Design a protein around this ligand. Sequence first.
Ligand SMILES: Cc1cc(C(F)(F)F)nn1CC(=O)Nc1sc2c(c1C(N)=O)CCCC2
Ligand SMILES: N[C@@H](CCC(=O)O)C(=O)O
Ligand SMILES: N[C@@H](CCC(=O)O)C(=O)O
Ligand SMILES: [Zn+2]
Ligand SMILES: [Zn+2]
Ligand SMILES: [Zn+2]
Lengths: 260, 260
Amino acid sequence: NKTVVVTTILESPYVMMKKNHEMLEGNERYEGYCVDLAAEIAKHCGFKYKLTIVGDGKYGARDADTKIWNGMVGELVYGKADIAIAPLTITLVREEVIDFSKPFMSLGISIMIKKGTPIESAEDLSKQTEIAYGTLDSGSTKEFFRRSKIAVFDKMWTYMRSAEPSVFVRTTAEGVARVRKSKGKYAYLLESTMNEYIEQRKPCDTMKVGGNLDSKGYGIATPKGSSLRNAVNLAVLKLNEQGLLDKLKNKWWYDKGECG
Amino acid sequence: NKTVVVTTILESPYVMMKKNHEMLEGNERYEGYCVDLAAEIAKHCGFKYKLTIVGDGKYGARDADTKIWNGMVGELVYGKADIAIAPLTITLVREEVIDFSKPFMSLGISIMIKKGTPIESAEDLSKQTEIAYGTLDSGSTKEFFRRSKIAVFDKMWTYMRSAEPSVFVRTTAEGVARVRKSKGKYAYLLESTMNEYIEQRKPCDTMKVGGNLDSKGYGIATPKGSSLRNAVNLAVLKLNEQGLLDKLKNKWWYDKGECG
Ligand SMILES: Cc1cc(C(F)(F)F)nn1CC(=O)Nc1sc2c(c1C(N)=O)CCCC2
Ligand SMILES: N[C@@H](CCC(=O)O)C(=O)O
Ligand SMILES: N[C@@H](CCC(=O)O)C(=O)O
Ligand SMILES: [Zn+2]
Ligand SMILES: [Zn+2]
Ligand SMILES: [Zn+2]
């Protein structure tokens, strides 16, 4: 009936521009895990769709003062998109305003270091000051630290919120580049999925250290009242049970892996 | 207003009879992860509740011929219970007939061996005959194998469905006992959570081997149209984000683990 507007975000390897994208049009410009997922979800739910990259390049957070949502969440809330198919973390504040499918991928917050950085844990980071560390802006990881009552994470947040120069970054790519150029003096807090991906990318100079700080998942999000909610939810479960989600993770993370 | 009837299942360490249960009343008769979780869900959602143990001791399957649901799923479907708070796996066939919250615990199907069994993977099991293997006789693990189109799992199902005497077991405890008494000649396919629990129980003679075969979760289930659906879902998210779910796992799996 109507073309479904999918909001997504340029985040490797979920959605990336193809090497030859400039000569391509519409959905064909993009590739990645979420591009593949979107095609599968659309197939099983029987809709046509248009992939649109989120205008402000953000996942989604609510301004404390205006109460206005930004990012992909904002696009859903304000009716600019019909569905978000992205590595969008299922969170309480978000699930209060949009609906999430069952998770299509699990993750937890993790630590990325430049190889050789003498840091093994969140506790290690919190104890010292020589190595700076931060998170992505307008995402679920920043909110995790902001809200945490756990002493280690509370101390980390107290440090991060005030740190000069700013330890927060606008994009995951910015966080990763920062780790890579900072000679071991910057650690980055990011989701395990993204961390593991980057660990298998040239120049193979980063690694994930320590356990995950939490356990959660990404979900496909729809605005409240969406006619797509049930079908999308069931389609995620179908794709999981077919082993398709695992196949896609292997395709985008490890099959193309550059670090041996 | 009205006391919420909770269906659950006697499965360690989720729900267990307290040693002194005969001298206790109602909800106080039980202990475990899901007992603790039920109390917290009820507090956060503002309802009074009565724990009940599923009459038939099953999780929930639909009979192929009668189309009747058994187990906890049936208790929800047929209106015998208002909510299931148990290690109940989120599956497509169940989500078609009941609602699940977001997952409160992650798990995958996994392999339990008697220590020293020369099995490292599902592939290993599928390629040999000396070591028998089976699943819980009703549940999502059996269904995974029944429905699988992946070669290794198909081969396994082909073996399991035809094996005489039956490789299937009535309860997890029966599966574990069978591994323990079979001198390495039986391996049990069960959820990683249950596997990890038993690995920390005396006599410390079993272990999880290989990676998980899939990735899913347990959810709190409510019948369709339940007024509890949203509150329960948000309560799971709140409890995850506040670290309670991880605390409860540690409490019931590891804090009093018997294997060092
Ligand atoms: C990969 C997969 C598919 C399925 C499903 F299909 F069964 F739903 N579950 N999972 C595992 C998963 O994502 N776990 C999740 S997501 C999530 C939480 C947990 C958890 N703590 O276990 C806690 C609240 C925030 C959102
Ligand atoms: N997946 C996160 C963004 C990345 C992060 O915060 O680490 C979100 O949905 O906000
Ligand atoms: N958690 C499973 C039962 C255990 C199993 O099948 O391994 C279910 O909900 O069916
Ligand atoms: Zn498909
Ligand atoms: Zn503002
Ligand atoms: Zn509480």
